[PDB]
Structure 1
Amino acid sequence: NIQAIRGMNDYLPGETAIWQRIEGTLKNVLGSYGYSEIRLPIVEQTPLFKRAIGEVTDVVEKEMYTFEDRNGDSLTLRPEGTAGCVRAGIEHGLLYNQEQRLWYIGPMFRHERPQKGRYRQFHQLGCEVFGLQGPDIDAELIMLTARWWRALGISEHVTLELNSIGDEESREHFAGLCKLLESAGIAYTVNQRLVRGLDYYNRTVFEWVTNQGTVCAGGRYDGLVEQLGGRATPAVGFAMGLERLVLLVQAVNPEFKADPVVDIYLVASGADTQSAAMALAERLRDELPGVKLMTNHGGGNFKKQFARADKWGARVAVVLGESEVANGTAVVKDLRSGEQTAVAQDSVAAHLRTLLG
């Protein structure tokens, strides 16, 4: 058996269920603010990360996954996604004299020693807005994170740190920023030693910390579009570690369940019943949009098939043996109470609607 590269995790069926609920919530809250999705390559050229994050940084100094391509070109698996974003923005023409409100989700890679919060393949959701300069947009992004925390019920577990690393212009801009948050009741701490670990930020720097600590981090980087070869454009954004979010919800929120995988299990036994079973299932799929129905396969006597229905968390089992098939019926069994009734096939969909919701 081959095993997994250390620090690269698999997310098994039970836990992805939770992952899909939290992502759906996050994308919804981004949708209500009018932010569009951009999808960017996993691999970029190594000079981008060297030129944008900075040469004397732990990321470039010791963390990147770099390798030589079949044409000599060095390629690096992205360690963060902002550089890639700016790059595509410049390349495609999306940023000059334009405003963009964007978000992205995907894997990032860093060769760090794995410990509980830190991984080699980890996933980030991040936002980047281009074209807005003043403190107002920076306050809209902090308002956006605050909403996500309310929505995931973790609000009384995340602290906001802020400060400027720029200066008159930056004293004014940071102050106006601080004024917008007071006037919204967002509680923040000005922490003068909060400099971030990447060298492209300038005025606003912030971090939402829990008590590996930082759950979300971001800031402003007004110069980076020009540095990577484009026209000067103001830009701000952040990225959050979806691994640490998932962990914090699950810990602070215990009663965060997700939807079970099967609702109705199609039990079927007897000679040549399986085409009938699969045909009934396809019809019930047409009739009950968005019902998780699973067709028993590989035989098994009724006792086995009913226990399999219990394994998946089915609430109702539709049964069919030869009799049902010849008589045009289907037996509907409410697995919660045992009450089973024979219904005509034409009427089973309505009988399930009643039993499920």
Structure 2
Amino acid sequence: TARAVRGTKDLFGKELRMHQRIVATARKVLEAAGALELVTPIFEETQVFEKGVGAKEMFTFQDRGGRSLTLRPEGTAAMVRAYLEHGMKVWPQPVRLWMAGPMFRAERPYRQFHQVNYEALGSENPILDAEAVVLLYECLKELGLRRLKVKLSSVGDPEDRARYNAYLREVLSPHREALSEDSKERLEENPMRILDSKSERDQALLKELGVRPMLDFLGEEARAHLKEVERHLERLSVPYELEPALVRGLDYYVRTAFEVHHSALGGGGRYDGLSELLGGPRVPGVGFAFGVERVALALEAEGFGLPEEKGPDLYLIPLTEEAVAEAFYLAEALRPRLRAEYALAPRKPAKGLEEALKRGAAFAGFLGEDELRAGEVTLKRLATGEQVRLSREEVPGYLLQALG
């Protein structure tokens, strides 16, 4: 009766294998660049994920005690919270961390998706921004994806963001009634957030007015930092395109911002004020995240198929009812060094052999009255048809010599 809640789903067979490949690939590239693997809890205190003061899409609840708890909606805040909790500030900087795991989004019935996160905390050095970009680019390239579009941009320093917001107030105020609910309130609290709302009505006005990009407002230091990042990518042969449409409305996002399109598979940027937001000292940061499901779809779109599940090394066919137990005893004697399976009911040799072929077994085994009395087994290498009769003590060795 009960089914998996909408927005969630079981992962098994090929879908699971695709997810595991994707994560295994990120693990290889990220750990080769020094990132340390970190796994945070599924839920945390709600305040860990609050973005600041400024007036539904997060699973929140309180446990026995009244404490507000929230299901992890993103990875960055949780990782920064971990860097703080474990005093990673004492480690050699920067501290590179990565993580793969489920995230929770509360939309109307993906509500549970998986993403890989990479975070370099502790330094403002532009080399780290270029590295974050290249690392994301690489994870995706290593997966076999091609036609990857890298989009780069900057959101400047907070003093630069202050001027832009003023400008936004001047340009968007005389068009107030064109916005709506929240966007009208954002004009007084955080104008830049209006550029990040997915309100078709708000997106419409913006498209018509065509206001100036945050790029045109980069301060002195911000422009030099972006130029450094650009220089590194050029030097690393990473094709990119400056994107004035790339924006980050939250007050803790600074300088570098980037995305990789195929539509966006992942992206990220620098976020220097998030640590203080959580109660910690100043901790410069830059990193990215990409959705595992988004990537699996991109691979699927490019035609990437996955080979068939490997079969057991041995599939035992009991011929009599008494042999069923003996098949189990033999298979157990061969595990786990070898993958050995067995049928639970007797059947004709031909039908059993037929089942071994379908299951892709390397060898088929037969146990009947004759082999039981002799304490032996009959083996048949399916691929070559070669059939041999050997004692039970010799099966492990024989199979190992053959499957070497």
Number of residue equivalences: 341
Q: Determine the C-alpha separation between the residues in 1 that align with 2:289 and 2:37.
A: 14
Q: CA deviation at 1:77?
A: 1.0
Q: CA deviation at 1:126?
A: 0.5
Q: CA deviation at 1:285?
A: 2.8
Structure with a larger share of its residues in helix: 2
Q: In terms of mean alpha carbon deviation, does 178-187 or 123-132 score higher?
A: 123-132
- 1:46 and 2:46 are equivalent in the alignment: yes
Q: CA deviation at 1:324?
A: 1.8
Under a length normalisation based on structure 2, what TM-score does the superposition of the two structures give? 0.77
Distance change >3 Å, CA 48–CA 86, structure 1 → 2? same
Residue equivalent to 2:148: 158
- 1:104 and 2:99 are equivalent in the alignment: yes
Q: CA deviation at 1:219?
A: 0.8
- 1:138 and 2:129 are equivalent in the alignment: yes
The aligned amino acid for 2:137 is A
CA contact (8 A) 2:150 2:239 kept: yes
Question: CA deviation digits over 1:314-338, x for unaligned, max 9?
Answer: 2321222232233233222233354
Residue equivalent to 2:64: 70
**Alignment counterpart, residue 339 of structure 2, candidates 285, 292, 295:** 292
Identity of aligned residues (%): 41
Residue equivalent to 1:202: 254
SS at the partner of 1:63? Answer: coil
Q: CA deviation at 1:162?
A: 0.7
Structure 1: state its 5+ residue gaps: none
Find the structure with the greater CA-based Rg.
2
Under a length normalisation based on structure 1, what TM-score does the superposition of the two structures give? 0.86
Residue equivalent to 2:10: 10
Residue equivalent to 2:190: none
CA contact (8 A) 2:246 2:257 kept: yes
Q: Determine the C-alpha separation between the residues in 1 that align with 2:41 and 2:280.
A: 19
Residue equivalent to 1:217: 267
Q: Determine the C-alpha separation between the residues in 1 that align with 2:104 and 2:303.
A: 28
Question: CA deviation digits over 1:297-356, x for unaligned, max 9?
Answer: 244444554344344332321222232233233222233354322234344345434654
Q: Determine the C-alpha separation between the residues in 1 that align with 2:22 and 2:311.
A: 16
CA contact (8 A) 2:318 2:345 kept: no
CA contact (8 A) 1:96 1:233 kept: no
Question: CA deviation digits over 1:78-112, x for unaligned, max 9?
Answer: 21111111112222222356432111111101112
Q: Determine the C-alpha separation between the residues in 2 that align with 1:189 and 1:168.
A: 21
Residue equivalent to 1:35: 35
Q: Determine the C-alpha separation between the residues in 1 that align with 2:249 and 2:373.
A: 72
- Please provide the CA RMSD for this pair: 2.4
SS at the partner of 2:245? Answer: coil
SS at the partner of 1:103? Answer: strand
Q: Determine the C-alpha separation between the residues in 1 that align with 2:402 and 2:53.
A: 63
Q: CA deviation at 1:120?
A: 0.5
**Alignment counterpart, residue 377 of structure 2, candidates 316, 327, 330:** 330
Structure 2: state its 5+ residue gaps: 157-218
